[PDB]
Design a protein around this ligand. Sequence first.
Ligand SMILES: Nc1nc2c(ncn2[C@@H]2O[C@H](COP(=O)(O)OP(=O)(O)OP(=O)(O)O)[C@@H](O)[C@H]2O)c(=O)[nH]1
Ligand SMILES: Nc1nc2c(ncn2[C@@H]2O[C@H](COP(=O)(O)OP(=O)(O)OP(=O)(O)O)[C@@H](O)[C@H]2O)c(=O)[nH]1
Ligand SMILES: Nc1nc2c(ncn2[C@@H]2O[C@H](COP(=O)(O)OP(=O)(O)OP(=O)(O)O)[C@@H](O)[C@H]2O)c(=O)[nH]1
Ligand SMILES: Nc1nc2c(ncn2[C@@H]2O[C@H](COP(=O)(O)OP(=O)(O)OP(=O)(O)O)[C@@H](O)[C@H]2O)c(=O)[nH]1
Ligand SMILES: Nc1nc2c(ncn2[C@@H]2O[C@H](COP(=O)(O)OP(=O)(O)OP(=O)(O)O)[C@@H](O)[C@H]2O)c(=O)[nH]1
Ligand SMILES: Nc1nc2c(ncn2[C@@H]2O[C@H](COP(=O)(O)OP(=O)(O)OP(=O)(O)O)[C@@H](O)[C@H]2O)c(=O)[nH]1
Ligand SMILES: Nc1nc2c(ncn2[C@@H]2O[C@H](COP(=O)(O)OP(=O)(O)OP(=O)(O)O)[C@@H](O)[C@H]2O)c(=O)[nH]1
Ligand SMILES: Nc1nc2c(ncn2[C@@H]2O[C@H](COP(=O)(O)OP(=O)(O)OP(=O)(O)O)[C@@H](O)[C@H]2O)c(=O)[nH]1
Ligand SMILES: [Ca+2]
Ligand SMILES: [Ca+2]
Ligand SMILES: [Ca+2]
Ligand SMILES: [Ca+2]
Ligand SMILES: [Ca+2]
Lengths: 219, 216, 216, 219, 219, 216, 214, 214
Amino acid sequence: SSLSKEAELVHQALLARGLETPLRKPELDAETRKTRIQAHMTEVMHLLNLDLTDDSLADTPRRIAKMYVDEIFSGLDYENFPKITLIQNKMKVDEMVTVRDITLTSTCEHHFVTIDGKATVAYIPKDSVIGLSKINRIVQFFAQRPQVQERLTQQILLALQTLLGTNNVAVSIDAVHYCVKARGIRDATSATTTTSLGGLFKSSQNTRQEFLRAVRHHG
Amino acid sequence: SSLSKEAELVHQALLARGLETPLRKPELDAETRKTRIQAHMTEVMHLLNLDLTDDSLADTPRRIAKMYVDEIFSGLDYENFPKITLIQNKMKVDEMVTVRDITLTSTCEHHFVTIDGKATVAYIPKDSVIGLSKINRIVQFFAQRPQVQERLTQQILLALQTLLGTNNVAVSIDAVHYCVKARGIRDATSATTTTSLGGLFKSSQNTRQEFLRAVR
Amino acid sequence: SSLSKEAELVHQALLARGLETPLRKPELDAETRKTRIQAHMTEVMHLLNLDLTDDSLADTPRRIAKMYVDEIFSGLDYENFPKITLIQNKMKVDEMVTVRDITLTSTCEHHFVTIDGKATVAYIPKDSVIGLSKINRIVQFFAQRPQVQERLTQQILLALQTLLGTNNVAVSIDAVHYCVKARGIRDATSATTTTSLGGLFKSSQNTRQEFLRAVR
Amino acid sequence: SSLSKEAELVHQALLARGLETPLRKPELDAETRKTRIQAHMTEVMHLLNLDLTDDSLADTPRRIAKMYVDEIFSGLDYENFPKITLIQNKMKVDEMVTVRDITLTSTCEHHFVTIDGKATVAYIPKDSVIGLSKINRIVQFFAQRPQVQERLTQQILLALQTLLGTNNVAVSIDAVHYCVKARGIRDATSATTTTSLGGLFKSSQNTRQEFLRAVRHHG
Amino acid sequence: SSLSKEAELVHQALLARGLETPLRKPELDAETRKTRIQAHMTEVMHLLNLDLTDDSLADTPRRIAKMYVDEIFSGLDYENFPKITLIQNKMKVDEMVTVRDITLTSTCEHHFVTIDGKATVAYIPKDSVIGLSKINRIVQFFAQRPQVQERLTQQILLALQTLLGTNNVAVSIDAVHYCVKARGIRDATSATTTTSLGGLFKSSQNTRQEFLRAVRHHG
Amino acid sequence: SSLSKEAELVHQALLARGLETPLRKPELDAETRKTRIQAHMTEVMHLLNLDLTDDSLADTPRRIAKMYVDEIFSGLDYENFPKITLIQNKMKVDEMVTVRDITLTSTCEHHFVTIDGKATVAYIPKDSVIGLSKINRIVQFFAQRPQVQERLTQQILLALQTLLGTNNVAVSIDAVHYCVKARGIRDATSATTTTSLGGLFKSSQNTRQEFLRAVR
Amino acid sequence: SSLSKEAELVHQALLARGLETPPELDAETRKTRIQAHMTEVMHLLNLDLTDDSLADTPRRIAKMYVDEIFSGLDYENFPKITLIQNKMKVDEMVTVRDITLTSTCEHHFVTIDGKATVAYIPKDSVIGLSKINRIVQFFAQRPQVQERLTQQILLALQTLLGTNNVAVSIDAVHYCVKARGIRDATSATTTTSLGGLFKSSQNTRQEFLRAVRH
Amino acid sequence: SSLSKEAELVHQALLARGLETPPELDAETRKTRIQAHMTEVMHLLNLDLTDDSLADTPRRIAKMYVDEIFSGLDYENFPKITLIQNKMKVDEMVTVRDITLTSTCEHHFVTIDGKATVAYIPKDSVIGLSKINRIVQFFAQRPQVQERLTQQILLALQTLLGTNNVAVSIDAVHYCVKARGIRDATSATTTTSLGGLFKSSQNTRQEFLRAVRH
Ligand SMILES: Nc1nc2c(ncn2[C@@H]2O[C@H](COP(=O)(O)OP(=O)(O)OP(=O)(O)O)[C@@H](O)[C@H]2O)c(=O)[nH]1
Ligand SMILES: Nc1nc2c(ncn2[C@@H]2O[C@H](COP(=O)(O)OP(=O)(O)OP(=O)(O)O)[C@@H](O)[C@H]2O)c(=O)[nH]1
Ligand SMILES: Nc1nc2c(ncn2[C@@H]2O[C@H](COP(=O)(O)OP(=O)(O)OP(=O)(O)O)[C@@H](O)[C@H]2O)c(=O)[nH]1
Ligand SMILES: Nc1nc2c(ncn2[C@@H]2O[C@H](COP(=O)(O)OP(=O)(O)OP(=O)(O)O)[C@@H](O)[C@H]2O)c(=O)[nH]1
Ligand SMILES: Nc1nc2c(ncn2[C@@H]2O[C@H](COP(=O)(O)OP(=O)(O)OP(=O)(O)O)[C@@H](O)[C@H]2O)c(=O)[nH]1
Ligand SMILES: Nc1nc2c(ncn2[C@@H]2O[C@H](COP(=O)(O)OP(=O)(O)OP(=O)(O)O)[C@@H](O)[C@H]2O)c(=O)[nH]1
Ligand SMILES: Nc1nc2c(ncn2[C@@H]2O[C@H](COP(=O)(O)OP(=O)(O)OP(=O)(O)O)[C@@H](O)[C@H]2O)c(=O)[nH]1
Ligand SMILES: Nc1nc2c(ncn2[C@@H]2O[C@H](COP(=O)(O)OP(=O)(O)OP(=O)(O)O)[C@@H](O)[C@H]2O)c(=O)[nH]1
Ligand SMILES: [Ca+2]
Ligand SMILES: [Ca+2]
Ligand SMILES: [Ca+2]
Ligand SMILES: [Ca+2]
Ligand SMILES: [Ca+2]
């Protein structure tokens, strides 16, 4: 109810597709949820046998709680959705616009550790041309959630289709998963690329290959 | 019976294809096999005229035995098959997922020396999406065997098809073989690429080209 | 008593220096600590308003518990100290030995997020020469703790001095901190280098410069 | 007794320094030792449960035996020591000559797996200037042994000092150890550098730093 | 007659194709031809006004003779053909196997100076899979001749098609010719690429482009 | 006699130092010597079992003979020495002038096989500043002989000092020897660096390290 | 009448196509007169030609024009061509890349610095490699326009090789653009001329063009 | 008499040091006469000046000499200098690197292409950054010898900044060497002029020089 019309359009579009991140309605406010998380992380640290009396560690549970609710999972709250600016396509662009090497930082939902990546996004403007920076903001909004890279790519795609009023959008993400790099198999070199293509990017081999060939060069 | 359902499924698929690594059924436990290999490697080092009274060398046979059975050849034992986790394709991905630059280390079965490479794997999820690290674990499981790169590539492919429940998988491996680089011709610059393509990666030229172009 | 002689020697050296990681003595076994952490992480995820009925998410608390206790923080337990092997310096090396580009992954103790870096270690062997992989194992042991990079560097240094029986050791670490890159200021380009120098690496300007120049 | 005077000078110099690789006198000939090693590796392969009836594996024990005695450990036999060619230093070079990025392949003596590296060698000619290629040959000769990188560097240094008739030699080796990379800790990125410096390279800070600064750039 | 079956099969195929290096039958053993080449090269040095009494220069004619007959032109003698080892294609590979960046050193037949390059070879196994090192060996065999680059490429192709029992082979070479760089026009930058494509690699546009596109990352 | 004064100064200075390429006076003219060299190379090719009726090989003896006398060994004839222009150091430069990455192609005198290198030259002008291209020309002159790298470097050094009227000259050559790469050991990676330093470049440690650090 | 047979074939080819670069005195006299003119110019730039560094500049310039950088105007300077039979029956393109190319802006008389890439499919004959480099530099040593230079190299090779299957690409920095006027320090210009199969056959055309970029 | 105070200080400085580049007609007339001379040269190269591409080349050249590439001979073209007080009390070197530099060989009149690196330690004043680039290019737009050009930039900056603590390094490719004569396609030339502490103080000197290389 306190959401922008843009935020609301995108959330409902995600829900109707089955794509929304698995959520429940909060019944505690954010300040209280921060506090309760802090208490729980305090115990965790005790259960790791850490000495919380040390000046360096004493504030860690508070820092973590803050980080979870306000920082890295801020994209779970649609009040944080970016404000959307659109201008008319008076200049009548009908070739793709591409924003590449977008900084993306997320968190894998199976181990709660860092995902570090880059997104590349393109679209063919129909009636509206979006403010460039809103593209980076939308990618970062969906990334500030516990994620599976596959779902993250689909979410950013559907959101952009919805705001731009066109199906002709493509999203590609290339990322290092620290769940892979820093534990378990500990593969120091691998990276994962996922792609979600809509409209002509999916179905027009020249549009599709133009997009895909362009990604290949950087990651 | 002692193997996971996944591991037994992969092994039987490899066997029906003729792709399983040349194996005989085990008659001795892993620990006595280790003990005996240690015995044989002792004589080998004697026969090389090396002095085993050297502190540096004294334990090498035991180290080697331990390495063969427990590490570089641990993929000969399906009890070491990775645990497999799959989530539902509820997000409905229908474009390829590509894990590139997978660290791979193996052993050439003709000379028993190091193979050093990188794998790239892609699949189009059907009903399931695999945990990403499981792709790196599967590649390394098959790599921890005496191998011919051509067979290694096919085994990884078929194992992944079996577990993902789809033929839409592709595997590419690029590797330096030390049996080419460190002896014989001693080619210090060359490397070998092999590729195994399934379903659309083999037959669908847009999907096939998309994967092959990405590798390069 | 349950720890190796090496591990106990390192721990007591760290303790006498004031360098040990802030620890309390264990009152609960590792397995019940895991069980309990799993309980707390369940509530955390509830408090984030996440839906744990999702197949993808359902097991995350258990995965996290398991990760903290058994993997990324396993260096809090000296039973996991690496086995140490030393051979006699019979070859009489008296110039530095340098292992560079050691893979290092840690966790910042202020935000509990990933630290990703590379260590470079050098020493001048006195009576003993260490097995090379043991240098990478020691770096990673200390890294698998909640850490402040400045403390991590000093702990690696002192542990190596203790085991090598010489003060002539140097440690340098270069790392990206995700608590700087992935939240707060979100500096995507920066990195931090810390360096701890012992014996001649600190005081001898030719030895000191030789190491520092090599790092760059 | 069937050794060149060069080979004999170097072997005795190594022995008197305590640096020779740990060896015993053979009492079987090489052809017989190959055969006996083949028999033992055949058992090893059986103990790995491998099927030796397969065309690909049947010849592996023979290949391995051959590789050990004639290929990778050929440097254990001083009849394989390279022939040494020297010309007078009529041109009176008194500045270092440096051969860098010498291909080096060896085998670590603790696990019997590949070492892959590059050596850099320099010396200040006194009376004699060596044929360039003999430098690479000497490095490769000592490398074709089970090795510890520390001992390998010292061996190549003393050998060159002995043949060149001067102490002013330096050796640096930078190498990837597959005992580290492909088993155990499995560190995909690290590398080890060792240095052995004689004469002015050890003791003259300008000669020493000129050598060391020059290595730094490539590895 | 004294050749291996593989060497004879390949030599006859090249002769029936019209592709063999222009050879005559040797009336003199190799040792005698070295001795005579040494005599001729001794005279060439005299004719260059060089002082053969110089310690550095005295053995040069013998070194050159040994080099021509036993080293850089050893591929003129099919007794030096590689041993070929093949295993059954039981694993049923039916895609391209590619060995890239094979070290190749040869000699231009027009000026007898160094060619330095890299080969890339691919094949689709039919019934057999060749030992990888034999591909490098086969490339170097043909390279150890006075060559024209475009002939060298064709000969490697036919040799490989002959041993492997399939037309589906491709060879590509990229090389610097010192008869271009070190004399005449003295072009420091240029290089030459030649391509020989058989069976599917010539005829099947996807197979052909998969090969050619993969080479492009040669240089 | 038929030389430029410069050619004669350099030749004489190299003769006194003992640095000349081992030569003796010619009894035949260049044209006769080319004809005779073509006859010897004709026979060598015949003795290699090559078939001279082939159009592509037929002219090879004549090409080689031409290449030896007039091209790759043209630096043996001091009539081929570059013309030397100098302007006055009116600008009063007193810091090294460095020409780097000079193209150098030469022949190994032990095997008669290509050497491919780069030179770096620097000098501190005294009375004269040399035409920049003349430095490239001097390097290629001495390189168009059968050489050993150590001698070549000393020759270019003294030749420059004698023409510039100052000892303050430095020469560094970095080269790949095909006698190492294409035959014998066949090391595809290695390269050789030689340096010759005169005047301040040898003794003055700031001038010395300035030149050396710049070569890298 | 004093040219080689090849140099005549080429020159007639270019004339007939309309593709030649747009003779009373001998080479020696034209130098003396150029040198006289360049003297006045330096006077007109207020330079002091008594300076030792400067004194000999007019003759250097004259010599550079006639004998060096515009030596390609003289077909007596055309390279010698050697062909061998295509006995080896090569029927795939042969490509020489990164050919060193240096030339002059015909509009401002300023340095052009580039690289050429040339490919052909041998029909009956296989040209010596280094002659490809020589033909490129022959045409480059003229005042040029990059578009014309590329077309000239293409027709000449086609003529000498007895096949239309030849392709030429040149990538170059013009100091007319970098050192003067707009002073764009980063830009470069690519031109391509494609003949026979390189123009018409999409796989031959794409193989060439894909190769250039990579 | 028509120059700025700074341009006069610099010109006198260079004259007094012996470091100036070695005036009857106005700029407009010298162009017309240069243009007339370049016409005859093209005639003497046997070029057809009726060609549209070629027709206007003589005037382009004249204009390029007087107004563009040799515009540095005219101190009326000397850049404007703005200094601010060193209120911030910087006493460590300030370095501008990779300054775009384009010039001409005074010996063959051929393009020089380089980069300069300049450092100084501000004493009383801090120059606007872009004026450092402008001073470098002012001296470069003359027929030059690299060794002289570097010394000129150094004295000029010293004069304008009121400190001897200035250092100049230039790294450049001369087309006199690359496109002509020996045709060395890979070589480049570095020259350095060091003043005050940059010459005398080994740590200041090494800090500058170490910085250039890296
Ligand atoms: N489409 C397009 N957008 C541009 C271009 N240059 C800037 N923009 C965008 O124009 C938008 C500005 O509109 P507003 O939303 O009012 O800007 P803002 O309020 O400051 O919001 P933010 O930029 O996100 O911080 C930004 O989002 C820019 O990315 C451009 O060249 N093309
Ligand atoms: N499909 C997909 N999987 C991911 C993603 N991020 C992490 N994963 C994987 O999800 C899987 C988690 O399942 P589990 O098998 O229970 O994890 P684990 O038991 O600790 O096993 P390991 O990861 O091998 O150590 C791991 O394989 C992760 O690497 C992602 O973005 N997409
Ligand atoms: N010092 C020096 N040696 C060189 C140079 N160029 C070639 N050489 C060496 O000269 C030696 C030739 O002498 P020999 O031992 O008779 O040559 P070889 O018998 O063919 O032996 P190998 O070269 O090892 O195969 C080689 O080892 C070359 O490395 C050089 O420029 N300087
Ligand atoms: N000093 C030195 N050590 C080496 C060299 N090559 C290998 N090593 C090390 O020698 C050690 C062997 O001792 P062990 O501890 O018995 O080997 P391990 O028990 O299998 O232990 P890990 O190597 O950690 O798996 C290993 O650490 C090797 O990495 C070398 O060249 N020099
Ligand atoms: N097809 C294939 N061959 C391999 C692979 N790894 C190693 N090889 C080859 O297996 C062959 C070994 O068979 P043999 O010919 O009997 O070995 P060899 O006699 O020592 O021959 P060389 O290796 O050439 O010295 C070598 O040619 C290797 O290059 C692989 O992964 N696939
Ligand atoms: N087709 C082909 N030509 C080559 C090859 N290697 C060298 N060449 C060239 O073959 C030509 C030999 O013919 P000639 O005209 O007699 O050589 P040249 O007279 O010395 O002329 P220049 O090479 O221009 O100095 C030279 O241009 C070589 O560069 C090759 O592998 N294939
Ligand atoms: N198409 C083409 N143009 C070239 C070539 N070389 C130089 N030019 C251009 O020819 C043009 C000359 O036309 P003008 O209008 O007289 O040049 P200008 O009046 O000095 O003005 P600017 O060139 O913009 O500084 C310039 O734009 C040059 O860049 C070339 O090889 N091909
Ligand atoms: N020291 C110095 N020399 C330069 C500079 N620019 C050009 N030169 C050189 O000045 C010299 C001109 O002298 P000349 O002997 O008349 O030149 P040339 O007769 O045409 O002979 P080459 O230059 O060798 O082709 C050439 O060597 C140029 O390389 C410079 O900036 N500094
Ligand atoms: Ca995970
Ligand atoms: Ca093998
Ligand atoms: Ca923090
Ligand atoms: Ca080991
Ligand atoms: Ca040699």
